[PDB]
Design an enzyme around this catalytic site. Sequence first.
Site, PDB file in Angstrom:
ATOM      1  CE  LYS A  10      43.235  38.190  46.259  1.00  0.00           C
ATOM      2  NZ  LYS A  10      41.916  38.805  46.624  1.00  0.00           N
ATOM      3  CG  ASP A 137      44.439  39.463  42.657  1.00  0.00           C
ATOM      4  OD1 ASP A 137      44.898  40.465  43.261  1.00  0.00           O
ATOM      5  OD2 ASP A 137      43.223  39.255  42.548  1.00  0.00           O
TER       6      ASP A 137
END
Length: 299
Positions: A10, A137
């Site tokens: 990401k 995350d």
Amino acid sequence: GAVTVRAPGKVNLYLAVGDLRDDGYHELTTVFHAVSLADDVTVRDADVLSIDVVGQGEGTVPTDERNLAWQAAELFADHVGRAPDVSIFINKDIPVAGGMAGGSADAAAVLVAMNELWHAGVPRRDLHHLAAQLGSDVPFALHGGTALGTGRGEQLATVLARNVFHWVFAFADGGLATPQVFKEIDRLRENGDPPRLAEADELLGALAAGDARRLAPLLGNELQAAAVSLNPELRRTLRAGESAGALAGIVSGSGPTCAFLCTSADDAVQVSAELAGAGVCRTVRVASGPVHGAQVIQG
Ligand SMILES: Nc1ccn([C@@H]2O[C@H](COP(=O)(O)O)[C@@H](O)[C@H]2O)c(=O)n1
């Protein structure tokens, strides 16, 4: 009898960091964006739990309980009432301790791979809850695409990114520990009154319009000042990618990877080549997003 799952790295297109909470996390608002720099995780039934790694961190990355993938296998097995008797092979392109949540990708991948391997039929909502126990995350690595992350980052609301967006990533010589970077933003704020991001509205609009040129000047990451405080040489990397023709450069997450948004695939080919020649980072990658979250690709 092996299942292979690909899970994406990401970049935070937007990352506003709030106050330190009772639970020891910071409140935050982020726009996560999943990119084609990914890890591939192959899970097989085995006599004992084990992890092996090639690619980024091949020398390096622990393969015992330090590895978030270990804890993902234990948690999933316990959820389904089985022993975590699986071998986990991680072929990593996501940089280690780089701000792109590679360990989180690996943990997400393990959840999805074990679900398929065992045909456990555990639903997305339940995989999400397990992900949230593993790390802030991990849920995004399951979710992929582009999403608005709130709370500690584990609460997700999908957003539209109405194009393919083209990226160059500059890996650093070393890594940064995520808790040190959050401590450093706290320190910087104790000391001064540094600038805060505006609301995410305009950036989310640019994304919904599919417009990289509009998006570029709206990108922002409140941890970047902390990462740059700890690693001031990152300023040279940012400057180099921008001068090479990137629309914008930002530190990814807690760093020290630098991300550069480009106008097109061809633009990223040019920017990455110029940046590799500049002598300011360890190695360079080209990627695109948004890409899917953790998904089975073989088996
Ligand atoms: N929202 C968040 C996410 C992470 N962190 C810091 O980063 C560390 C690692 O977080 P995760 O284990 O969730 O990846 C936390 O222990 C905390 O120090 C934070 O302070 N606020």
